[model samples]
Target: LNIKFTDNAVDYLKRREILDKILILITDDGGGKYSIHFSIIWLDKVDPDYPVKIANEQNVKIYTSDFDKTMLGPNMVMDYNAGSLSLSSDEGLLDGSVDIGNGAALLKANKNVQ
Candidate 1:
């Protein structure tokens, strides 16, 4: 996985004590062939379902399930600017506005989303 994270994004996560582990889940809305949403969640420990993506120079672990992985494109970029986190790839912007959440909240409630 070629994932890139900007310095601002790193700092943002660092303050929240979630710099190391990032969990990404895919949600399909409007039924099957409509829109696929990618949500970011902070995690303390590695979840078995969401395996770690290959580490890059940034040293941040990006966790995603096998199914969710398929939804992503190559060369992913995570950027934080103007108080927002965005995800883009060679295929274009995957999620222009990604919501950042903690491990205890939506992560637990939407375990099946992965």
Candidate 2:
């Protein structure tokens, strides 16, 4: 899966330089529909729950694997603005159920850009 991060988002991430923080796109399925939520965690571990890891450009990563069950299309993004973070996608992954979500990418520690 291809994920896009806005330039501002990229810059913010670099400045914050969070270590061991993983970007998560948690998925829930219910009533025949799905929902997607985003979270940043300080986890760099694995799980027994089956999950698909998405490959991407950044050394740091984004997670949203169970999304396979949802309507994940192109244009998945983590938008940055207003001195905060925002996310977007055409996937309708907002339902219910702790799918445990999948691991998308390895979060890289942030540092000032050279």
Candidate 3:
């Protein structure tokens, strides 16, 4: 999986004592599964703390779409083809995680909208 962060997300991480760093990975695109480049950032150098740790430790499911929304919202619930998962707002207060598969990418908050 690959993940990316918006500009606001940088500040968000910093507020939580997490240092953001970009990481690139080679991913499969199905149909012979060719390698493609994707990007991700981490909340911690090793294991994440708070909400991120909960998700990682629990092997919680994540989605590309609505990630930012969930991050900004009071709570988040993720449902995929396999199963469903949720993260409370309090859990998200300290740190959050988002996973981007294949063609998915992070959504940017629009200044014009808000």
Candidate 4:
């Protein structure tokens, strides 16, 4: 996985204090093909199912599910702009408006959404 985090993104992650355990989760939103959403979440620990990828720029660990590996392509960029996190790749935007959330709340429910 080739991931790049913009300066703004790095600042946001530093502020959130989740550089050590960050998960970029993929979930279905009950819509169509574009319903798949991306979320930035803080996790207490790592999950084998969610493999880790090191950001080329920051050397930060970013975890995403094995199932979502193919969807992300070879190179991906995460940028924080306009108070929202955006994900894109050479293929194009994976999730233009990614939501940031607490992993405890999201996974505690054992579901995608809160």
Off by more than 4 A, model 2: 19-21, 27-37, 48-50, 65-73, 90-114
TM-score of each: 0.75, 0.51, 0.21, 0.75
Q: 1-114, model 2: which lDDT tens digit per residue?
A: 666666876777667664235554543333211222334332355432325554557665555456452544455566666555665556633222222222332212122221
lDDT of 1: 0.67
**Candidates' C-alpha lDDT:** 0.67, 0.46, 0.27, 0.68
lDDT of 3 by residue, 1-114 (tens): 223233454344445433333222222233211122222223212312112221222222222222223333333222222221112243442222333322212212222335
Most accurate candidate by TM-score: 4
- Local error of candidate 1 at residue 74 (angstroms): 0.5
List candidate 3 segments past 4 Å from native.
20-114
The candidate, 3 or 4, that scores higher on TM-score is: 4
TM-score of 4: 0.75
Q: How far is 98's C-alpha from truth in model 1 (Å)? A: 0.7
Whose TM-score is higher: candidate 1's or candidate 3's? 1
Cα RMSD (angstroms) for every candidate in the order listed: 4.8, 10.8, 15.7, 4.3
Error of 3 at 89 (Å): 20
Each model's backbone clash number? 0, 10, 1, 0
- Tell me which of candidates 1 and 2 scores higher on TM-score: 1
Pick the lDDT winner. Answer: 4
lDDT value for model 4: 0.68
